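Annex B.
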Amino acid sequence: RTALSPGVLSPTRPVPNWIARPEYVGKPAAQEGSEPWVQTPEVIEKMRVAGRIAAGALAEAGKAVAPGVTTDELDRIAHEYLVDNGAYPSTLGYKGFPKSCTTSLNEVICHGIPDSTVITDGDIVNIDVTAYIGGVHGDTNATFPAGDVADEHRLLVDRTREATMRAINTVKPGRALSVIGRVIESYANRFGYNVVRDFTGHGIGTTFHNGLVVLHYDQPAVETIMQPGMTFTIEPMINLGALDYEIWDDGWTVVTKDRKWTAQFEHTLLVTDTGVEILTAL
Ligand code: MET
Ligand SMILES: [Co+2]
Ligand SMILES: [Co+2]
Ligand code: NA
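Methionine aminopeptidase: predicted structure tokens.
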């Protein structure tokens, strides 16, 4: 199974005029980066709605993952699920991104652009879907096996899922945010994997990437303490090979330089008064 190259992009998928766009649609940048880290009760409840719809779309697209399917098709399925539930796909027109979700196979670390790429037996396919509804976002991703995947890749996906859920389980008010990347990097290193450092989790609320950064490796210099009402993602990318990467011509698709495969999972989390709530649970 050879290194991937880009395929043919399908035309822009339409969204009914009635669904409100985020402010950044059409524009070269987004108005984000300085929003409150702790959300109002109103925004938290709206975030449950957005989280559930993103989880739905993710699950629908994941069910279509099979040898012979295109990444564009997965995008079509996510896009239609979002639009059907009155959500805007937050990636669509985000910094010029042309599609409604990211689809990242095998050596693609993240940000793959859905296209005519055909999935084949043994591939691993991350689908990352974000929903915008009620003025708020919900962001979730998972890596799905296609046909008969090699044990080394099954394990990488299962261990990345587990690293994610372990880190989610550390979330509680008064705990240092740095605990998340300590738990993930510890678990990854136990199996000789390497955690991607350049790409991180993020605060999310009325804006997509609100300025809060969540590191997935051990960086105890971060002083942030988790607070009730804080909303962010945990979304580690875990590599079999070295961390070095390249970005394609399209300006989005990130691939490992050594072409070894990588996996990712993501949820959007709320810090509660005593622990955590996974907003993108289905
Ligand atoms: C093309 S933007 C994709 C962003 C991604 N959903 C994230 O979790 O930040
Ligand atoms: Co995402
Ligand atoms: Co995210
Ligand atoms: Na990958």
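The pocket of sodium ion (ligand 4) is lined by residues 104, 106, 108-109, 126, 261-263 (CB under 6 Å). The helical segments are 41-63, 71-84, 151-168, 179-190. Further annotation is deferred to the next reporting cycle.
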